[PDB]
């Protein structure tokens, strides 16, 4: 399908309820005469930014919210205009996930998180810890089964383990995700990835396992557990496997932390059907009946629409989804997310296949991601940002016992209490600084900034700020 005025083309991932969505499309056509074509191309999230400029995109694209900041920076999304009454129908935190630089850039549909799914006939009590899986697999192999199979090809599925003991994508500091502060190669990420690679080393899992392989093995009853989202429940229902959905195992006593996605619908900037797309999304899809149709095809998870979520919340499988979601973290939607995922994808694949050691693979991923992020800001921009901060300090200085404000060439010091150590967060406007650190001065009992013995120098300690250099 190609875009045409007076009809709608919608893209959604092949794991989602595209047939349920087409039923919503059918009702839209019945009512309005506007034909709706739903497609599920492979790699649609990469394809969209490639083909939009040629006029080969959809009118509406569905994906988890994490990709949308990138699309918005590239000018590929139309602005959406839900009035206040409409916005009030959805949970505020679902709107937050689709807010980029203060604008709503897509409609939220549903909250997704991975859970542990287990076969109750093979395993009545699911393991509480990752650590106990190796012995569980040993026991099951003897009966011609395996403990656990999940998609190892996509970092989304391995992340919850990587994050458990301390891995993170970007640090949130000073009211934003700090792209200088990337947590892909710290001790926590390395611990989690090592545990995974050890499972492979010890033949508890196979490095080649992908989504379809894992799904079939669980649904055929060949493996005791899988890790998957709410969309997978339908096929399990069909297979008649006796299954439960539960909290992911802990690692080193800590919860697994899945990255939480809000499935969202954005409108192509190049669509001549923006008003029809709005009508479809607000008045047909985002209704009790619209979401039920999609949900009955493949479960959406916790829907963004409050009225319908209030029903679905009583489902124990949704209760488990929300439990894992709260233990996890909502994904950033910043443009840097695709580069983050690429780096982790490569790191996991390389570690799992033995191409690299765990430490090499994550160091490389961290290095390559950071190389890209650290190239954004020019010297000229960085000078401009410091100059702005200087002009602010000079304002504060003009408006002036405690120590007094002064400019030290990088930061404006505040008042300091007599005889005290003064700590100032490492300034946000210095791109390369560590922003979870503080710079330090000492204030005299006499209300003068402490000097360096045998110098006219003022003492300051910026060692925490320079952590990354």
């Amino acid at each position: 399908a190609k875009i045409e005025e007076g009809k709608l083309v919608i893209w959604i991932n092949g794991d989602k309820g595209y047939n349920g969505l087409a039923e919503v499309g059918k009702k839209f056509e019945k009512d309005t005469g506007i034909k709706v074509t739903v497609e599920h191309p492979d790699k649609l999230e990469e394809k969209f930014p490639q083909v939009a400029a040629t006029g080969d995109g959809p009118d509406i694209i569905f994906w988890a919210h994490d990709r949308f900041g990138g699309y918005a920076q590239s000018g590929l999304l139309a602005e959406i205009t839900p009035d206040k009454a409409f916005q009030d129908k959805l949970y505020p935190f679902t709107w937050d996930a689709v807010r980029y630089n203060g604008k709503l850039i897509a409609y939220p549909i549903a909250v997704e998180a991975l859970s542990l799914i287990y076969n109750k006939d093979l395993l009545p009590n699911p393991p509480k810890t990752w650590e106990e899986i190796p012995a569980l697999d040993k026991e099951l192999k003897a009966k011609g089964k395996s403990a656990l199979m999940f998609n190892l090809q996509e970092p989304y599925f391995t992340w919850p383990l990587i994050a458990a003991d301390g891995g993170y994508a970007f640090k949130y500091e000073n009211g934003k995700y700090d792209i200088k502060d990337v947590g892909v190669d710290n001790a926590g990420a390395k611990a989690g990835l090592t545990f995974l690679v050890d499972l492979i080393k010890n033949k508890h899992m196979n490095a080649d396992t992908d989504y379809s392989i894992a799904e079939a093995a669980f649904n055929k009853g060949e493996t005791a557990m899988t890790i998957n989202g709410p969309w997978a429940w339908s096929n399990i229902d069909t297979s008649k496997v006796n299954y439960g959905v539960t909290v992911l195992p802990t690692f080193k006593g800590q919860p697994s932390k899945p990255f939480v996605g809000v499935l969202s619908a954005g409108i192509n900037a190049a669509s001549p059907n923006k008003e029809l797309a709005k009508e479809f999304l607000e008045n047909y899809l985002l209704t009790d009946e619209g979401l039920e149709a999609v949900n009955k095809d493949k479960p959406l998870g916790a829907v963004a629409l409050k009225s319908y979520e209030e029903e679905l919340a009583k489902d124990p499988r949704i209760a488990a989804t929300m439990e894992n979601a709260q233990k996890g973290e909502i994904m950033p939607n910043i443009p840097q997310m695709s580069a983050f995922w690429y780096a982790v994808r490569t790191a996991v694949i390389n570690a799992a296949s033995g191409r690299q050691t765990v430490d090499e693979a994550l160091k490389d991923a961290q290095t390559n991601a950071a190389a890209e992020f650290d190239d954004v800001m020019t010297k000229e921009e960085q000078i401009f940002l410091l100059h702005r901060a200087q002009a602010q300090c000079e304002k504060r200085l003009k408006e002036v016992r405690p120590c007094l404000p002064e400019w030290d060439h990088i930061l404006c010091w505040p008042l300091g209490a007599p005889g005290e150590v003064v700590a100032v967060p490492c300034p946000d406007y210095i791109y390369d600084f560590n922003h979870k650190g503080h710079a330090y001065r000492r204030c005299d009992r006499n209300g003068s900034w402490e000097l360096v013995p045998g110098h006219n120098r003022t003492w300051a300690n910026y060692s925490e700020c320079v952590k990354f250099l």
């Binding site: 650290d374 010297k379 030290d408 060439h409 990088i410 390369d432 250099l469």
Partner: peptide, 20 residues
């Protein structure tokens, strides 16, 4: 490229701070 230029500038800025 940008990163090298920017960090180099900051090291010189960190040094003005030290001299202050």
């Amino acid at each position: 490229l940008n990163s090298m230029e920017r960090v180099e500038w900051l090291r010189k800025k960190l040094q003005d701070v030290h001299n202050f």
